Structures are given as structure tokens and as C-alpha cells.
Design a protein around this ligand. Structure first.
Ligand SMILES: Cc1cc2nc3c(=O)[nH]c(=O)nc-3n(C[C@H](O)[C@H](O)[C@H](O)COP(=O)(O)OP(=O)(O)OC[C@H]3O[C@@H](n4cnc5c(N)ncnc54)[C@H](O)[C@@H]3O)c2cc1C
Ligand SMILES: Cc1cc2nc3c(=O)[nH]c(=O)nc-3n(C[C@H](O)[C@H](O)[C@H](O)COP(=O)(O)OP(=O)(O)OC[C@H]3O[C@@H](n4cnc5c(N)ncnc54)[C@H](O)[C@@H]3O)c2cc1C
Ligand SMILES: Cc1cc2nc3c(=O)[nH]c(=O)nc-3n(C[C@H](O)[C@H](O)[C@H](O)COP(=O)(O)OP(=O)(O)OC[C@H]3O[C@@H](n4cnc5c(N)ncnc54)[C@H](O)[C@@H]3O)c2cc1C
Ligand SMILES: Cc1cc2nc3c(=O)[nH]c(=O)nc-3n(C[C@H](O)[C@H](O)[C@H](O)COP(=O)(O)OP(=O)(O)OC[C@H]3O[C@@H](n4cnc5c(N)ncnc54)[C@H](O)[C@@H]3O)c2cc1C
Ligand SMILES: NC(=O)c1ccc[n+]([C@@H]2O[C@H](COP(=O)([O-])OP(=O)(O)OC[C@H]3O[C@@H](n4cnc5c(N)ncnc54)[C@H](OP(=O)(O)O)[C@@H]3O)[C@@H](O)[C@H]2O)c1
Ligand SMILES: [Ca+2]
Ligand SMILES: [Ca+2]
Ligand SMILES: [Ca+2]
Ligand SMILES: [Ca+2]
Lengths: 443, 443, 442, 443
């Protein structure tokens, strides 16, 4: 229903990224325009992938959502929305079938399809294959001392051509970038977890071959990869390398998990920086460096069966090496394998591996580089973009028109809480964003 | 949305009973008239003084036995405003229920949801009306053809009789208590359906060492037996069952596809012999079975008695399996009742202060209620025959086409094990609205 | 420590079979001989070359269906050296098993536990011996009374016949494959009991798109159906069942009291009518049922196919309910058989490279084995009748009291649903040692 | 089979305390003397309580063990022992019935009965009702300057009379003592969790009275008390006061829990003090200030039901006050209720309560007072007892004979790991203790 804006027109809103966060904004805008639900803006979305896809590099077989399907992209804002997960199922003729599953945790493949089904209804306003590379200040009058729009430049991921689009307002919703240990070198055989399903098969084409494959880390991504490798490459020898002493379980308990409630964002944001830092630390185990207990137990059971076959752990096909860090990687010459050097992680062993899967998490700072050509518009003394409660970043008012602005989505954990980077509050936050950006225009 | 019809007018439809089945029809009619989602003269008569859902069995901790997705609207249209999720959103409780991580709300909570739905229809529901007669009406003195029905109800407070005229009747009156034959009439012999409303009046002192027997081994018997040991901590309770053990309900996913709304067509279109065979083979999904978790809790309570005393005969709370009651003897209120037991195979004497009889329900009450119109059935029929759309066969030479009677909730034999449950109410509500109002709504 | 008896001597007891039932007797005799806890001339004959527990069905990930406490000793004496926990302690694995927090070891692990037990009786077990007949013996040329038995066994690898003489015999030979009568004999039609041992030799290319059918809907059919989809990832598998659905086994605690060892006394004393009715009423504990967790796993795999394609007819792996096989075309050089299906209610065909037949077992094989002594039964018996202590009725005028035959594992009709399982083996082994050797040990 | 030594004789070993730690030693000595298990020392145990009892003040209805029954007092050392939990069940005629329970976690009540069954076989070497008060040095030749025995002085609970027993070797196995926040005054209405079942009923006799009852803390003891009070006093208003933001789940994941393995004691002890501290910190959530998830979920569901009835948390019968600390208690005067003053626990609110349950944990320092009169025998420069791997404390060899010594049990978490104070390694540690104390004597 949302109609396209011509590429060279002045947009009202341009969103960088079309993952769940921008999709929830698109959905919330649709719903706010729906006479059936409420009491058209010139909008477009740029997405570097060639079609909608949700962490496709980590769609390992059997992987599940880590959040109740009720926390979809609409329901917590309005269960009557056409964009609920249950309505998607009903449109697919699968609602009763999903009901008989008796699970709150769909396969990630299914929840990706739900979001693909939503995203297809916005295809007229999404430009796929466009990687935004810079955002530059615009002036309607060149002799004005005030920026009143932004030019967003994007690179065609197939041809390299640079496109430009003008917009009053920008949303940056680009998720995370791979965090690599600084000491690891670049090599086609060292692959971050985010590119597991998508590039490792190309590297290791023979599923029956006895590859040596190592996994670095001990959070959910590492555990899913380590566990999947033993099925994907049944004759491989896999090694899980972690600096902790053990995989530790994610905190799914209900009182702790109320920090993810949508209505907590007001209170979290109003707290002092010192309190927000302490709170995030105390609740870290709900999300970071932890594994769903059910997957830990599965891996533990697999280890036990190896113990039944051979009591000597050093002889096991699949091994966990706890409290170790990689200190050196040899990787030159035509030989297939790298030599990983391991030391204790407390305050030498070597391994010959065909590939090293690096499951060491994500950073959420890439908006600083994307926004570098407008960062002179920030107030003096800021080395970082500062979002208000409504996610609009602070601009020097002598330099930027009140009609122009930039909002950040998904990189605001420090100011808005641990739910900021997840699916947890997207339905409600998308509704807040539509009111913040479009509210006056709608009325 | 549904406006009252003056009590004197010729109604389009009168529904007898305002339990979940009739409520689902009201909701389906509301949704069919809702321009977001897509007036007849309708009224409902309910004997209870307000909406209430097996209030006599609202024992503490009792839970739904069916996923909340099978509420009164979602399987027909997840966008409906009458979904359980939207009810939670309207109550400010949606996020809190999400953190519960359960498909099975407390029965108390699901009653409040349906009561919240029911309040939307307060203009078209007359509470405290017990329907006692359905009378054939002939608007033409010069024709013996019946073209409407007069429904007579007795007000439970005044006892006055009121009459309403309607073209069509829905009979949606649930079940009546099934009692073993030959029990004496004694206020201390109480059917499970009146457990919460009658037993506390009879046994007022919660600390007294009452002897309380429970007859049966299905879900009602297990919930009552388990609850009595908490409600009367010093009581001596006895579960009497003719089976050798409580058996677990079948909640496995392939078997339970028989409850899918789209299976109604398939079940109906089978011969009487195959329908009868089907119901028998699948009986363990519903009848004479207990949810495994409750079985396990009762078993653990029994085990703890064994820890304290190895002699089962001296336990406070006991199960007497493979027993039948030969008679319940009484000598007035001055003394306990005496339950005489023998083997249920093709002996004990119990002295009790009350006998909870959890022996299930019959769904044949519509036969008495419709006795004054049964001469309009085709020659030879001794029971009402519903077609697929739930309308009973009438002799077409005796009843007009504008007049009809439908049955809801008593049609297991022709429509499947889901008929008496919540399982297909949302979808069946939609079909009923089509069958009864479809043309009227098309014009 | 059970010492061997010279083969030509007259044994006190000869046991046919060395599966868990006979093994539980050996363990109970060992424990009865141990003054720490509290020698007859005994020998066991086993057709397999070593101890093995349904090796043809040791599917990856398959689990015990009974708590490890019902091992081969604990319910009779938790102090026994032959408990599962002591075995783990001896293996250095007890703390590691504890951390699993499960009552259900892998079948592979429980087999190893019983193998560890069985290796301690190697002095009294002859493997590779298939018993073929039991013939009566009369040690007195002047009396017509049978007072011993000769057990004749064919060596598996040499085919040579050996004769062993014994006063008492135990038959503990488990079950035989039950096949639907209308199926023909073909290398591509394999009973579930030979899944792991026979199917790989027939279907050698783990990556080829075979069509593989599975007949039945009990635990065996479910385990094979689910496993085939991993073992042959490109196969098209089909579960053919005459019921409408896989149904869950009853593991609920009151019902499962029927497996309690002390229940055998009460069950045995019931009438034949009551025992038959009782067995029927409790059938869902054991027969034609699937553990709920596995049903749900199979259901979830079906659901994921529906996510990828809503048309069930085009799914890789399918279930075909309320079907019966009316005909199999298997003659010809074509690698695939054609299966003809009809409704099982009182024209579709499948072309398959193999049909796995998971249709259960019979436990009547002792009738053929004992045929040369069946004239010793009392008149008017067409079956062997076990007493409570598992000794079969013999005509007193024909058989001396110091001679007898006991049956193990085939007495469900008289001793209850626990008879064929591991459930009462520890306790039953103790009772058997008392019945067979009790007067001898006192 | 262990026979009494006359009270006035020189014992080989005297154990202070007869809880699970001392009982495990008694069991290991018995097994070491059994020719079945391995092909008599003068020993006595002194126990303050009148019979064996295992945290009887916290035997709340429904409380369960938090460790697999396989970790009983013998099995991990020798599954053949007559003192295993499975053998105890067999002796009681309950083994099959417990098997049908399908649980690794007996009721605490049942596990206490198991240990009482073990303890009663040592009744000839245990003096109950004896509170040890001091350990004093002994010189068999008083003119010499070498200590070669110890006199253990104990107060008879019934008569207060002091008796003295002499021994070469002493074991201190006295568990923990109630830890109270230093700011709380002494008052009969302020009760530590350790005395909940035994003292609170004496204080609040009428189970139907609407008492106000507060609970301080958020570990397992606070959760069990908070949950139990709501059943024990159905009309009470209970309040859980915690300085954390929420109850947090205990870590029962299997890799982490390998720290409780008996064979890990060697690994843990052989680490530096820095690394022992760091590791105890990393694994703290297995044991301290945490609650079993299933209990958290049950309390959460009870709170949810209150919310169904009334969305305003301030009106709930039972409430949780997070991030609070008690700053003042008013408790002088004849009024039934104390006034508790609360403030935020972050770096005006009052409650009036009939009682305050203090679930603030335990200290394990009480051995230092009992050994004060021998702490001059430590080597020069120690102000704390230093146990070696085999749990014997370091003595100055020029002052203490090699045939005399003191061992500590249960208070050595610092040096021996998180399992030290639990049942986790008692079977194995008992065997080790028998070898250390009586090894040469038996060989
Ligand atoms: C493997 C994995 C599984 C997860 N599972 C869950 C879960 O089950 N439940 C849950 O609540 N959360 C989960 N998360 C957390 C995750 O962050 C959210 O699920 C969600 O993806 C966040 O949405 P988003 O739109 O903020 O970020 P993303 O999903 O990362 O989306 C960002 C988008 O922007 C695009 N983009 C990036 N840079 C540019 C650019 N320069 N120009 C144009 N486009 C660009 C990317 O291609 C991407 O599509 C998971 C995270 C990972 C890594
Ligand atoms: C204790 C109990 C618990 C159950 N729990 C579940 C569950 O968790 N999930 C599930 O799917 N099903 C459950 N059921 C099955 C139950 O039948 C349905 O939940 C549902 O109540 C059926 O709805 P109904 O409108 O058909 O009948 P009812 O709910 O019985 O309602 C019929 C109505 O008609 C009224 N009535 C009867 N006679 C007259 C008259 N002469 N005049 C006027 N009014 C009359 C009654 O007062 C009542 O309000 C349960 C049944 C029982 C007994
Ligand atoms: C696939 C499968 C899985 C099962 N899993 C379980 C479980 O987890 N828990 C449970 O309680 N029960 C289980 N059962 C039931 C099973 O019957 C028992 O576990 C157990 O195997 C019975 O032991 P048995 O010794 O009486 O028979 P078996 O285990 O069958 O042993 C019989 C032995 O006799 C031998 N034999 C046969 N004929 C001769 C002959 N003529 N001469 C010499 N030797 C002969 C056989 O080789 C065999 O070794 C399972 C059954 C099957 C088929
Ligand atoms: C409420 C609670 C529940 C617990 N549940 C578990 C569990 O389920 N699993 C687990 O692994 N651990 C559990 N623990 C940990 C607990 O420490 C162990 O269960 C166990 O109690 C340790 O035994 P111990 O003998 O070292 O100390 P205790 O059990 O404390 O025994 C110490 C004994 O010494 C006696 N004593 C003390 N001082 C003197 C004196 N001066 N003179 C004479 N006698 C004295 C006491 O009377 C007492 O009997 C629990 C602890 C608590 C508080
Ligand atoms: N199925 C799903 O829904 C799914 C799947 C995957 C991930 N996720 C979610 O995505 C988010 C990220 O999870 P993640 O596992 O990818 O990342 P993560 O939680 O941040 O874990 C990163 C792991 O790598 C380690 N690590 C980080 N830097 C390291 C370094 N320089 N050297 C050595 N080790 C290092 C970390 O150890 P330290 O803690 O010591 O730094 C940790 O073990 C989580 O919220 C997760 O739940 C969800
Ligand atoms: Ca949860
Ligand atoms: Ca289910
Ligand atoms: Ca069970
Ligand atoms: Ca665990």
C-alpha cells in the first residue's frame, strides 16, 4: 500500500538498512495509515543485501528464535495488526499446524519467512542491493548557514555505481558488524560466525572429508556452530576454543527478563549513566556470552557419548579446550591448513585447522563511520552521537534546521537498555518512531 | 455494535445459552459486521446471572487444557478484536502474560477473557432466563405450516414466564451432570460441576477432619481429589475408581490433529460406523483421562505419605482402584453416609461426610427442551439429526424454509470430538453466522 | 568366579540363550554364592558370537526406555557388584553420568553395561551355539521316567552338533521377527530387527535419492523412520501405518506400577479372563506406541517441510496413515519394488528401493525347540504352562521331580507385561536361583 | 558395628558435630572395616542436637534436595556400600516406588530420613545433646613442651554440665552459623531463616490471621520462605525485600557444575590464591544468592494471578520490593507490629510487620572460636587456620606431636572449592579422611 517515491525527489524519511528494526517502522507506518486501526509520507529504505534476509549466515539447521513469537513486529503494539506472526500463519494456511507444535520459539527459518512475508508488502519502497557509504549535509539555499536535508549516497553491490538520494530525515538501523579479535590475521579460512552458512561451504566443499575445524568463543553463536559442524561434517575433528572455563547458561528467568519489557525503556533511559552501566553489567547473562541451557545439555550429552567410546578425552573426535586464547596464526604457503597457537587465558599448544570459525560477537558502532561527513553538526564536545529518548540524535541548532534530523536504531543499548538491539521492543518502538518522525505530518 | 431487539418483535435468531459456543457466534456476527474485517435481530437467553465458565470447577490452580490460540476468534481471524492477545493488550497485561511463557492460562483468567468478550454483548443477552419450552408458531391461521418458534423462559429470580418469537433457534446449552443410577438424594452427594459452589457451604470448617470421597478417574476427579487435600488439610480423602489407575490424556501432536477446524468436514463425511470407530480410537484425548502433570503431582503426594508410613491403609489420603459403589446408605443428617464398595471386575465400607461425584456429563438435554417441536421431525426419527451446518432435519411439509433450529456442542457423533470443546468455536462461529445470516448479510 | 563345568558332565542347569534374562540368572547365582551378600554345574548357550543387545536396532541416539535403576541387579540388591552405578564406577564414568541428569542411558551404553557383566561369566558361556532341540533322557534302563535332558546345539561357524546333558533347562531366547503374512521374501524387505546390520549392505550409497518405506507405527517404526532421514539425507521416506496416527506410550506413574516386581504374584493368580483383559487395558504402556518426545521430533520435522512447501504430496518425507499393503511387485531386475496400498478401513502405489518392516515380535519359538519333550506335558495342553516360579507343568508319572524346564521372557500371558522387558530381571533372576538351586544351596 | 569407647579414655579421633560431613566419615570408616568392601579405632562424635537432624528449621513443605541422589553419603566412593540412598530405599521397601517417581531430587524430608537411617547405625559412638565449647591442648608428659593430645570440652544440653574427652585427633565439622545484617536489632519478631519452621509458628499461632510478614533476601531460603508463607498463612500479607533488582536463577548447567566433581578438589586446591578467588567468583551463581528456576517461575505465576485480579501491584496481597534496604527497625513498645524503614539500595517508605524473616545466609567462622585456646600452636605468623589438601590444619612441629592433629570439614571453600560445604563430595571426602586419620592404624 505504501507507494514509492521517485529516487530524485526530496524524501521525508530514508532508512538505512531493511532488517527487523526498519521493517517494524515500515509496519508501524502502514498501521498508522490504516483507517481500520487508527483514530502518505515520502519514505524509502536502503538495504545492502539483494533481498530481505535475517542473519542468513547463521541459519543453522534446527536453530530457533530466542524470544516468544508474541514479540513479533506488531503484536505488542497492536494484536489486531495484519503484520502479526499469527496472522502471517493464517495467511499461509499454517495457523492450526503451528498451534499443534506447542512452542513459543519458531525455527529461525520460519521467523525469517514471516519477516520476508511482511517485507514483501513494502517492496515498492525498499531499494535492495544498495550499500549506504556516506551521508552528507544538504542546503536548500547554498548561502544558508543551516543544513536542512541530507544526501545519502549508496553503492550498488553488483556494479559499484554510486546513487544519491535526498531526505529531510535519516534513520540508521544497520545492526551490528563482526567483532574480530585484533590479533587474528585476515585469511579466507578465518571466518566470522556471521558468514558461517554462506561462506564456509564454499571453502570446505566436501562434506565427508575429515577437516580439522576450530571454533573460537563460547556464546550462543559458537555453541550453535560447534554443534552444527559435527553434523554438517561428520568425519571432521572440531575444537571449541574459549577463554572462559565453561559455556554458561542464558538467564531466561521471568523477573530478570522484565528488563526487556517495552515500558521499561522510559525508566531505563531516565537513569544516570552510572546506574545504566551497573544495570547492564548485572543483567549481562540474559544475552551476552551465554548459551541456551538446552543446547549446552545437548553438547554435554554428545561429549558424554564420546566418553563411553573412549575414556581418554585427548583422543575424542570433537573436543572443548577451555581457558585458552589464540596467540598466533600461521597461514602462509599453499598448504590447506593454518597452525593456531594456543596459550592459557589465565592472568604453548598448537592446532592444525582447515578453517577457524570466529564467533566473537558484534560491534554496534558503524554508524559513526557512516555519519562522519555530518558529525561536524553535533554539539561541541561530543565524540559520539547522542540519542534522545525518542532516538533522535542531538544536533547543534545553529547548524541544522529543526525540519532535519537523524535517528539511530539498534545501537542504543547504553542509553535505552538491553532490549535495544533485539526483537524485544521493535513493535512498540516502531510505533514510537512513526509518531516522532511523522506525527505532526499525519495530523 | 449489536443493538437490542425489542422483546416483542419477531427475532431473526434466538440462542439458548450464552456460554462459549453462543458467545463465539456473537463474536463472529460482530466481526462479520465490522468494516475493518469484512443488523440482524438477535438475542441470547442465559440461565446464569452473568457469564460464567464452569464456575463450580474453578479450583485454584486449574488450567486451560487447550492452547490460548484456540480462543474465540484467532483461528477464524487473528485480526479480530476478540482475540485473547488483544484482550490482554486491552488489559495492559500482554507483556506480563508473554513473560509467563505458557500456552495454558489459568481457567480463572480464560473465564475473565470470555467475560470481557461477553460484556460487549450485554445489550442482546438476557441473563437469569432459564429456557423451558420451544413452541411451534404458525403466523397463518389458514395454514398448518410452522414458520416461527416461540421460546419461553423462566426468570430465575421472579419465576415469571416470558415469551420470545424467532424465525430461528440455536440450542447451545452444554452438558448436564451425569450421575450414577440409584444414588439416594442427599445434599452431601454433590456432582463435580457444583464442587466450588456447594461443597464449601456444606463443609464450612476448613480445619475439621472430614471424610470426603471422590468418585471417578477423569480430569474432574483428579482436580477435586488433589484440591481437597489443600482446602481441607486435616481431611481424609478417598478416590474411588473402577479403572486400575488414572491414565494420561493424549496431547501428542498427530493424534490431536483430529481437533483441527478443517477436520470437521472430513469427520462428518464418514459413515456412522467409521465415525463411531474413530471416536473410540481417540477417546484418550479427552474422556476418562488426566493431564500427566497432575497425575505426577498426585503420585508424588502419595509417595510422601509412603515415606512417613509404609502402610497404605493408614494414609490420610487414599486411592481405591478397581472398585464400584454397590450403594450409598444414609440414616439422615445425624450421621455419616456409608459407601459400600466391591470389585469392579466382572470389598470396603467407607463412612463419609460428603461424596463428590465426578462422573462426567450428558449432552442430551436438548431433547426435553425441544419436545414440543419434535413432531416436526421427519417420520421415524427419535433424535434430532443435524446436517453439516448444524441445522436439524425438519419435515419440509411441516416447517417453512425461513424457520430452523440449530444445535451447538452436543453433536460429537456427527461432527467429532472437538464439538463440545473450545477447539473449533471461532471457526464454527463463522460458519454459523454464514448459514444463519449469510444471505441477510449479502443483501 | 562361576567355575566352568566340563562339557561331558551332567549339568545342574543349562540355559538356552545368553541375553539379559539369562544374564540376570548368572548374576543372581553369583550374588547368592557371595558370602559378602548372602557351586552348581551351570552352562549357557548363545547363538551370537558375543553378548549383544538388539544390535540390529542400535540406532544413533536411541535411548533406554526404562530407568537405569531397573538394571540387572539393583532392585534385588543395590549392593551387588553388577549394578549399573557400580559398572560406571568401575569405568571411571560415575560422576560424569550423574551430571547427565538422566534416568535413560543410550542403548549403546546400556549394552556395554550388560557386556561388562556378561564378560565375567565367559567361563560358563559357549557362544556361537544355536540350540536346535531338547531331548528327554532316561538314566534308568528299568524305569520309564525322564530324569534329565540332552540339549543339542549347532555350532554357528562349523555346523557341528554338540550334546550337553543337564537335569534342568532354562529357555530364555527372546523373540522372533513377526512379518505380515502377505509379504513376500525379498532382500529389499527387511525386518526392523535387522535394520542396522542388513540395510547398509543393501543401500550402500548414503547420498543417493533412495525411496525407503517403513511399515508400522510403534517405537521401532518411528526410530527407523526418523533415523533414515539422517542416514540417507537425500532419500524419500514413507511411513505406512494402518492406524490414523502414531500414539504416545504411557509412562505415567500409577499405570506403570504394573511393571513392579512384586506385582507378578498378584497378576499370576488372576483368572485367564482377567489377565487377558488387564493386558489389553494396559497395552499402551508398551505395544504399538512411541515415546512422546520422538513423536514430537517427527512432527516438528514434518512441520518444517510444511513451512517450505504447503503441499504435503510434494514433501521429501511423508506419513501415509490408515493404509495397508495389498501387494508388492518385486520380480524383475529393477532395483525398485512396487507397493500397492489400500485403505485399512473395514489406487495408490509406491516404488521403493527397500521396505523396512517394523511389525514387532512373536515369543513362541520355545514351542518348536521343546517339541521332542512336549509329550511330557499333561494331557490336553497344546502349550507349555508355566507355574508362578516359571517351571513348566510336566506329567508327574513321566518326569522325575529333580528334572524340569523353565521358560523366561515368553510368559506375558501368565506373568504380566513386565515379563519380556528388563523390568523385573534382577528380582526374577533371584527367584529363579531359589527355584532351581535353592534346595541345593541350603 | 562401631562400638563405644569409654568417655574417659584417650580416643584416636573425636569429631565435633554429627551432621552429614561427620556422618560421611563414620560411614567411610565402617566401610573401610568391612571385609566385603575392602580386604577398631577409638572414635566418638559429639552433636549438639538431640538426634540427627538436617536443617530442620528449613524443612518447608515441598522442599527438595538440590543435588542428585547419586551424590549421597557413599555411592560416589563405593556403589556397593550398604549406606547408599538406593540401598536405604530397598531396606525401607520403597525402592521400586521411588523409581516410579522419576526424580533425581528427593524431598529434603526424605533425604533427612535417609541420613537419619544411616546415623542410627552409629548410635553407640555418637553423644547427642552435647554442645562442644572448647578444644584445649594436652601434654601426656606435662613437663615436656610438646602437645600430643587434645581435650574436647562439651556442655550437656539438658543439664549444662561440662564434660571433657581426650583425643589424639579432632575433626571440626560444625556447618555454618546464621548470618544477620549487622544493622538489625535483636527481637523475637526478627527470625533467621534457619529457625523458620521451628520458631515462627510459636510466634504466629493463628494460621488464619492476616499477619503482615516480611522476608529479607533473594536467595533460595528467602524464596522458599516467601512462597511457603503464602500457603501457611493464606490471609497474610507477605513482602519480599531484596537489595537486588530480581531473584536470579541458579546455574545447574552441566559443564559449569563439573566444579562439584570429587576429582576437581585436587585441581582446585593446586591453584594459586588469586586463581582460587577468581574461579569462586566466576561460579558463584551455582550456589549463592540464587534460586532454582522452577521456584522462581512458580512465584512469578502467583504474582501474575494477582495481576489478573488487580492490575495495581500496590494492592496485591503478596508483594516483592526490589532494590531496597532496611535502614531502621522500630520495635520497642507493646504494639504487635514493628515498623521497618526502607530506602533504595542503589549507591520515605515503611512497612508494619508482625514478623521479619531474615534469609541472609550463613557464616562458617565458628571453628575459630572453638580452636582459640590452641591457636598458639599455629606456626609463627598465622591468624587463620591453614588446611592442607587432606584437611589437616598446619601446626608448629616443635610444639605439636606428629601423632596429634586437627582437621576441618565444611569451612574450606577458599582452598578446596564450592563443593566443600555441600553434600557434593562427602562420600569421597569421607574415604579420604579415613585414610588420612586412620590409614596407618588400619594397615
Ligand atoms: C545469529 C543471531 C541470531 C539472533 N536471534 C535473535 C532472536 O531469536 N530473538 C531476538 O530478539 N534477537 C535475536 N538476535 C539479535 C538481533 O540483533 C535481532 O534479531 C535483529 O536482527 C536486530 O534487527 P536490526 O534491524 O537492528 O539489525 P539487523 O537484523 O542486523 O539488520 C541490519 C540491516 O542493515 C543492513 N545494512 C547494514 N549496513 C548497511 C549499509 N551500510 N547500507 C545499507 N544496508 C545496511 C544489513 O544488511 C541488515 O539487513 C540475533 C542475532 C544474531 C547474530
Ligand atoms: C470443568 C470443565 C473444564 C473444561 N475445560 C475446558 C478447556 O480448558 N478447554 C476446552 O477446549 N474445553 C473445556 N471444557 C469443555 C467445555 O464443554 C467447553 O470448555 C465449553 O464450556 C463448551 O461451551 P458451551 O457454550 O458448549 O457449553 P457451556 O460452557 O456449558 O455453556 C452452556 C450455557 O448454557 C446455559 N444453559 C444451559 N441450559 C440453559 C437453559 N435451559 N436456558 C438458558 N441457559 C441455559 C448454561 O448456563 C451455560 O452458560 C471443560 C468442561 C468442564 C466441565
Ligand atoms: C529394539 C528393542 C529395544 C528394546 N529396548 C528395551 C528397553 O530400553 N527397556 C526394556 O525394559 N526392554 C526393552 N526391549 C525389550 C526386550 O525384550 C528386553 O530388553 C530384553 O532384550 C529381553 O531379554 P531376553 O534375554 O528375555 O531376550 P533377548 O535380549 O532377546 O535375548 C535372547 C537371546 O537368546 C539368543 N537365542 C535365541 N535363540 C537361540 C537358540 N536357539 N540358541 C541359543 N541362543 C539363542 C539370542 O541370540 C539372544 O541373545 C527392547 C526390545 C527391542 C526389540
Ligand atoms: C536450608 C539448607 C538446605 C540445603 N540443601 C542442600 C542440598 O539439597 N544439597 C546439597 O549438596 N547441600 C545442601 N545444603 C548445604 C549444607 O551445608 C549441606 O547440606 C550439609 O548440611 C553440610 O553438612 P555439614 O555436616 O558440613 O554441616 P551441617 O549439616 O551443618 O552439620 C553441622 C552439625 O554440627 C552440629 N554442631 C554445630 N556446632 C556444634 C557444637 N559446638 N557442638 C556440637 N555440635 C555442633 C550441628 O548441630 C549440626 O548437626 C543446604 C543448606 C541449607 C542451609
Ligand atoms: N538462535 C539465536 O537466536 C541466536 C544465535 C546466535 C546468537 N544470538 C544472539 O546474538 C547475540 C550475540 O551472540 P554471539 O554468541 O554471536 O556473541 P556474544 O554473546 O557477544 O559472545 C561472544 C563470545 O566470543 C568471546 N569473545 C569475544 N571477544 C573475544 C576475543 N577477542 N577473544 C576471545 N574470545 C572472545 C566471548 O568471550 P568473553 O565474554 O570472555 O568476551 C564470548 O564467548 C546474542 O544475544 C545471542 O543470543 C541468537
Ligand atoms: Ca522464561
Ligand atoms: Ca501437544
Ligand atoms: Ca514416569
Ligand atoms: Ca543439570
Amino acid at each position: 500500500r505504501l507507494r514509492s517515491t521517485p529516487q530524485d525527489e526530496l524524501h521525508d524519511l530514508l532508512c538505512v538498512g531493511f532488517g527487523p528494526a526498519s521493517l517494524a517502522i515500515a509496519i508501524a507506518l502502514h498501521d498508522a495509515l490504516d483507517p481500520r486501526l487508527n483514530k502518505q509520507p515520502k519514505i524509502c529504505f536502503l538495504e545492502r543485501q539483494k533481498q530481505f534476509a535475517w542473519h542468513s549466515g547463521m541459519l543453522v539447521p534446527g536453530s530457533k528464535m530466542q524470544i516468544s513469537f508474541i514479540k513479533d513486529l506488531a503484536t505488542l503494539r497492536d494484536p489486531r495488526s495484519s503484520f502479526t506472526f499469527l496472522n502471517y500463519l493464517h495467511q499461509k494456511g499454517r495457523l492450526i499446524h503451528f498451534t499443534n507444535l506447542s512452542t513459543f520459539l519458531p525455527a529461525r527459518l520460519e521467523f525469517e519467512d514471516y519477516m520476508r512475508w511482511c517485507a514483501q508488502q513494502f517492496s515498492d519502497v525498499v531499494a535492495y542491493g544498495e550499500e549506504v557509504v556516506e551521508v552528507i549535509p544538504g542546503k536548500s539555499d547554498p548561502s544558508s548557514s543551516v543544513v536542512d536535508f541530507f544526501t545519502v549516497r549508496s553503492r550498488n553491490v553488483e556494479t559499484g555505481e554510486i546513487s544519491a538520494r535526498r531526505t529531510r530525515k535519516v534513520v540508521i538501523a544497520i545492526g551490528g558488524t563482526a567483532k574480530m579479535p585484533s590479533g587474528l590475521p585476515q585469511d579466507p579460512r578465518i571466518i566470522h560466525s556471521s558468514k558461517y552458512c554462506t561462506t564456509l561451504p564454499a571453502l570446505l566443499k566436501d562434506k565427508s572429508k575429515p577437516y580439522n575445524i576450530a571454533v573460537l568463543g563460547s556464546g550462543q553463536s559458537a555453541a550453535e556452530i560447534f554443534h552444527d559442524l559435527q553434523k554438517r561434517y561428520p568425519n571432521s575433528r572440531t575444537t571449541l576454543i574459549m577463554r572462559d572455563s565453561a559455556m554458561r547458561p542464558s538467564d531466561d528467568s521471568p523477573f530478570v527478563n522484565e528488563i526487556f519489557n517495552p515500558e521499561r525503556v522510559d525508566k531505563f533511559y531516565s537513569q544516570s549513566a552510572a546506574e545504566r552501566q551497573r544495570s547492564l553489567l548485572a543483567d549481562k547473562a540474559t544475552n551476552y556470552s551465554v548459551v541456551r541451557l538446552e543446547l549446552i545439555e545437548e553438547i554435554y550429552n554428545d561429549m558424554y557419548l564420546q566418553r563411553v567410546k573412549n575414556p581418554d578425552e585427548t583422543q575424542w573426535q570433537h573436543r572443548i579446550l577451555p581457558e585458552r586464547k589464540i596467540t598466533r596464526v600461521e597461514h602462509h604457503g599453499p598448504q590447506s591448513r593454518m597452525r593456531i597457537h594456543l596459550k592459557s587465558s589465565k592472568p604453548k599448544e598448537t592446532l592444525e585447522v582447515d578453517a577457524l570459525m570466529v564467533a566473537t560477537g558484534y560491534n554496534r558502532n558503524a554508524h559513526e563511520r557512516l555519519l562522519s561527513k555530518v558529525q561536524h553538526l553535533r554539539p561541541t564536545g561530543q565524540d559520539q552521537w547522542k540519542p534522545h529518548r525518542d532516538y533522535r540524535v542531538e544536533m547543534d541548532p545553529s547548524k541544522v534546521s529543526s525540519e532535519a534530523g537523524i535517528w539511530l536504531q539498534g545501537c542504543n543499548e547504553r542509553t535505552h537498555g538491553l532490549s535495544d538491539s533485539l526483537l524485544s521492543v521493535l513493535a512498540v518502538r516502531g510505533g514510537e518512531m512513526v509518531q516522532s518522525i511523522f506525527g505532526e505530518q499525519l495530523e
